[PDB]
Write a protein that binds this ligand. Structure first.
Ligand code: PLM
Lengths: 56, 238, 256, 270, 238, 125, 56
């Protein structure tokens, strides 16, 4: 019951398998890249447009 | 017995390694997740948040609020220099303790575009203009406004709107730059020159102040995690 | 026709209208709300006072002077003596709330100044001496604003809190506080500021007297500077509205 | 995951003003360098990977160590589990108000002879025991006390010369996450202990020699290493400034904002 | 020889680990199963069984049967307190030695709903009512019935049926609670107040007794196994 | 199986169980309820504390003697010092309510007696 | 002749194989959750209903 994924390159596959019955035994997940800056920058109710003056 | 040969690197403990280990408390039950506002999935979302810059480090004022304030006063002649500081976001004392400064010190390499946001806190009636210049290295910090012109400059004006944005572009002969001080990759310079002297009515205060901000654009990136020299220790805390 | 300078907020009975302001910073982007039944714990049915609770309150206005270091309030216990939200606080073992903070300081066009309104979840203040801890009387006061102190506090045997502004009492750089939600009251282009805080805490509900989870701070960066002949006394006023309150585990009256 | 592209731009004359905004809204302008100047089309292959939380918090770190001997007064070492007794790890966790993750423990044990006049000292391979005691459990006051039988409590037997031992632990907190900062008391009267010290009861960790191992005295050294995994975080905050003082509370000694330099114009640090 | 690298954690003996080992007596023959009444597949099926509560610990009565008995006597005025005890099922001396008490002490964390079953053993003719109150923490144990009202209370009546059930709901700001004593998570309080004084005919005995029971509802759960402080030892038994 | 002697009432937190009783007399035949919007007057939005208010209270028990004439309570002001219903009474200019009264006096089979529980709207002394 | 199952999580698969010829060599079974309280609670011949009085 193996699995296949991609390494980290720049300019391939590796085979990993979980050997234990406890989630905390699985290897770290280094690859989660999801990012949404909107939760710190732009925390306003009225959406503001770049191309327009801020206070009209 | 499947035949096998150990390889160099067995029975070693590496700090950064990735391996599986047997759990010490089998079938432990984990409490369910909760939905907490403000979930960070990446540090880059911290690096885009504004922060104040202690632009004035002079003397002993670093122990007061005045470290964050930039004096601006009406002169009798134009072309005087408001301030200036080198760009070395991980080394130079200016950015050192800033928000962007902290996150960098953990990382050796970086690249991107640093925004500088300025905001004029002076009296509502007084007006003025300013010249924000950026001089790439190769010559000393320009000592006369005429010299600052030949850089990349945004003439900025006070008025109904307040905040300004000077976006320092990314100009270097390499892809990244050392965050630690080195003369090879040294960043550049920044200056602010009076474009037109501050004009103030009667009964309105002469001197004003201008606060600065720092943020990283969406092209910002870092690399090669390390230790930060700032925090000290002696013996274990109790 | 429209304008972005003007805003009108209505909760329950009270209403706050402002003709000069900026937008409303909302939390981290999560508009406050009730508790979904997926995360619930308490099996008693929660009370939802709604209009009895949700509305605006006005605390004591505090003077603002050229040398004034700043101020801090603790939200979970400020209101405790005001209104039903003070009553419904004492009779329950649990509460869940979120806050709309509205700060009002106005001045003429001839007054320089800048303020910083930040709302800091779980601000934990140190102590004067290194060994002790702050007393419950020093960190808090009913409806009254506690203020900072511009210069270091001499360290005796007392329990006093460390009030230096540039460390902001938490021992961090004051210049960095903007990661938390905030807005800038600026006597130039602004009048009032506004914040909306959703419920932030490690556990889905909490006791109100034990754990003060949200701290409000107003720190002037650029002091008040004005030529003589203009009016001297400029107060600052704070307005605090709970939102979507809930309560559980009705018990006897008191805290002890 | 990849950096965004910088789109090219020609000249501009127009009434739309990217370069202006109002920071009073608490809104960081999104302006990109193509707005205030002319820009060439450029593809960036830089990646943000190493800046993710996982790679940031996950490195082994030495939280603490003790000394226990083979004979005399102190025959075992006891330690309560807090991350905050080591400077450089504690700071890395103070960015985030609420943290969630699964510890991975690794111990590193070493032995050292001690000066003595004992004659004909001949070593044998020592065996270290490491016992974990969840809160409220029985507490051994002596090395031979019955508690060391470990009828339940997870325990590890280790031997010199082998690889360092390792075990992984899942998420142990009661609530929905660990809490680094906690404002409040433990008592409804707002009295007693203040600060995060109240939330933290992790139990206790013990270690001992199994066997005397030789005639001459021997002192041992144990070291603990955390390696967080599967991390999640919430509500970032400013890094700490002033040097730490105590492990139970945030108390600090007032110190300046930054280092200093000469007159504002001066372009070099001092 | 397939190349391989040992990882940290080899040649260690972990107490709780899961691994396969070679059998010491190959092809041993196992006797067949039998069908034995009362097969336990899970400990939770023990935790739902009733058990008596030594509600009266006063003095030296713990060495007699009277530890399990609750005196109830006709008073001249109403509102007197029958008894009360804190809720700390793994710590408080009350539940300590109970059935539910034992199983908990092996576990650190728990949550659920504890039922309290009461049964009136008094004379068949005598009747009475009682107020069973539960006051969540935040204030001391209520010292007057009027204060006990504001909790969660079941007014319970003696009559043809005997047993009562007071179901303590689950109210806490966390999901679980420490089984060991801590002031952070402390459970609450329980009281019993005369609703209406015991009425007894002539020739029937004045004083009665009331026994208490404890059980865990079907939502009960535990976590994090550990040692139990109760059982002692000195040297190996012979 | 069933019985008419026994009844169990549950409101909010509290619960009252009685193994000997009669049926529950309901008003004049109108089960209590909220206010329909046809008859409303106040234009502010009403507060509905629900569980915070609705629940059972127990006042001071009073002795009953051979010569005891009787007793009276006034409901709108009795509770005024008890619970949130006492608090939510002081902070509002209006209220609308209905009452469930439950009187408990028990005795052995050898005690003679009879009581009268009436609930009198607008008793003017 | 492998086998696949699920770990213990909260908010995945692991591959196990039995290497020995004796049942007692197989790893422990931690996952059997089957529960029937009726063998201790409710041990009566006449089934009793919650909603009704016990002794009628
Ligand atoms: C031999 C078994 C050893 C088990 C090691 C258990 C260590 C527990 C680690 C808890 C982690 C970090 C938590 C800080 C706690 C808090 O302040 O709330």
């Amino acid at each position: 019951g193996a699995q296949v994924s991609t390494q980290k390159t720049g300019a391939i596959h590796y085979t990993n398998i979980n050997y234990y019955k406890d989630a905390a035994s699985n290897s770290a997940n280094r690859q989660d890249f999801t990012q949404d800056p909107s939760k710190f920058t732009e925390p306003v109710k009225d959406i503001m447009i770049k191309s327009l003056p801020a206070l009209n | 017995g499947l035949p096998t040969m150990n390889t160099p690197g067995s029975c070693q403990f590496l700090t950064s390694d990735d391996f599986q280990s047997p759990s010490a408390m089998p079938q432990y039950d984990v409490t369910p997740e909760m939905r907490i506002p403000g979930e960070v999935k990446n540090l880059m979302e911290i690096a885009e948040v504004d922060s104040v810059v202690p632009v004035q480090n002079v003397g002993e004022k670093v122990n007061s609020m005045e470290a964050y304030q930039i004096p601006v006063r009406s002169n009798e002649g134009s072309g005087t220099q408001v301030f200036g500081f080198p760009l070395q976001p991980g080394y130079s004392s200016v950015f050192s303790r800033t928000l962007l400064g902290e996150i960098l010190n953990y990382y050796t390499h970086w690249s991107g575009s640093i925004k500088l946001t300025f905001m004029f806190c002076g009296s509502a009636m007084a007006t003025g203009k300013f010249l924000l210049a950026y001089s790439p290295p190769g010559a000393g910090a320009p000592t006369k406004r005429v010299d600052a012109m030949l850089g990349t400059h945004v003439v900025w004006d006070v008025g109904l709107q307040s905040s300004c944005v000077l976006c320092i572009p990314w100009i270097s002969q390499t892809h990244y730059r050392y965050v630690a001080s080195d003369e090879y990759t040294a960043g550049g310079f920044i200056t602010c020159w009076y474009q037109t002297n501050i004009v103030v009515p009667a009964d309105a205060q002469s001197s004003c102040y201008i606060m600065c901000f720092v943020s990283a654009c969406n092209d910002f990136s870092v690399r090669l995690l390390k230790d930060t020299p700032f925090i000290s220790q002696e013996n274990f805390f109790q | 026709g429209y304008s972005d300078r003007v805003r009108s907020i209505t909760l329950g009975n009270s209403t706050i209208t402002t003709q000069e302001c900026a937008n409303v910073v909302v939390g981290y982007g999560v508009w406050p709300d009730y508790l979904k039944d997926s995360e619930a714990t308490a099996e008693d049915q929660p009370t939802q006072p709604d209009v009895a609770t949700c509305r605006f309150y006005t605390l004591d206005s505090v003077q603002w002077q050229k040398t004034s270091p700043g101020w801090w309030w603790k939200l979970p216990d400020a209101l405790s003596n005001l209104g039903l939200f003070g009553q419904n606080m004492q009779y329950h073992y649990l509460g869940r709330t979120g806050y709309t903070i509205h700060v009002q300081c106005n001045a003429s066009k001839f007054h320089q100044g800048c303020l910083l309104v930040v709302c800091v979840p779980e601000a934990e203040m140190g102590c004067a001496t290194l060994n002790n801890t702050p007393s419950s009387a020093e960190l808090l006061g009913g409806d009254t604003a506690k203020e900072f102190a511009d210069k270091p506090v001499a360290s005796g045997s007392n329990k006093l809190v460390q009030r230096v502004v540039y460390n902001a009492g938490m021992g961090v750089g004051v210049g960095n506080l903007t990661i938390f939600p905030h807005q800038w009251i600026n006597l130039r282009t602004n009048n009032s500021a506004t914040i909306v805080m959703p419920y932030t805490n490690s556990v889905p509900m909490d006791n109100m007297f034990r754990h003060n989870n949200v701290t409000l701070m107003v720190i002037p960066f650029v002091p008040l500077d004005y030529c003589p002949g203009s009016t001297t006394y400029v107060p600052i006023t704070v307005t605090i509205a709970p939102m979507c309150a809930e309560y559980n585990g009705l018990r006897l009256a008191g805290h002890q | 995951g990849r950096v965004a592209d910088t789109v090219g731009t020609g000249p501009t004359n127009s009434e739309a003003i990217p370069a202006l905004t109002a920071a009073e809204t608490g809104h960081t302008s999104q302006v990109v360098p193509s707005d205030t100047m002319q820009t060439r089309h450029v593809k960036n292959y830089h990646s943000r990977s190493e800046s993710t939380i996982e790679n940031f918090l996950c490195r082994s770190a030495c939280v603490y160590f003790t000394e226990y001997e083979n004979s005399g007064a102190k025959r075992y070492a006891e330690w309560v589990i807090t991350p905050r007794q080591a400077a450089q790890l504690r700071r890395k966790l103070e960015f985030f108000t609420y943290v969630r993750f699964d510890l991975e423990l690794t111990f590193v044990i070493t032995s050292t002879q001690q000066p003595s006049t004992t004659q004909n000292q001949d070593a044998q391979i020592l065996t270290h025991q490491i016992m974990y005691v969840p809160p409220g459990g029985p507490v051994p006051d002596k090395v031979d006390s019955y508690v060391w039988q470990t009828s339940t409590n997870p325990s590890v037997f280790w031997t010199e010369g082998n690889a360092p031992p390792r075990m992984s632990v899942p998420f142990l907190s009661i609530g929905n996450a660990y809490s680094n900062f906690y404002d409040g008391w433990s008592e409804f009267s707002r009295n007693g202990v203040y600060g995060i010290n109240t939330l933290n009861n992790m139990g206790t960790l013990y270690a001992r020699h199994v066997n005397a191992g030789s005639t001459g005295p021997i002192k041992s050294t144990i070291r603990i290493y955390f390696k967080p995994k599967h991390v999640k975080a919430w509500i970032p905050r400013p890094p700490r400034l002033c040097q730490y003082e105590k492990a139970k509370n945030v108390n600090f000694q007032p110190s300046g904002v930054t280092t200093t330099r000469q007159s504002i114009t001066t372009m070099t640090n001092t």
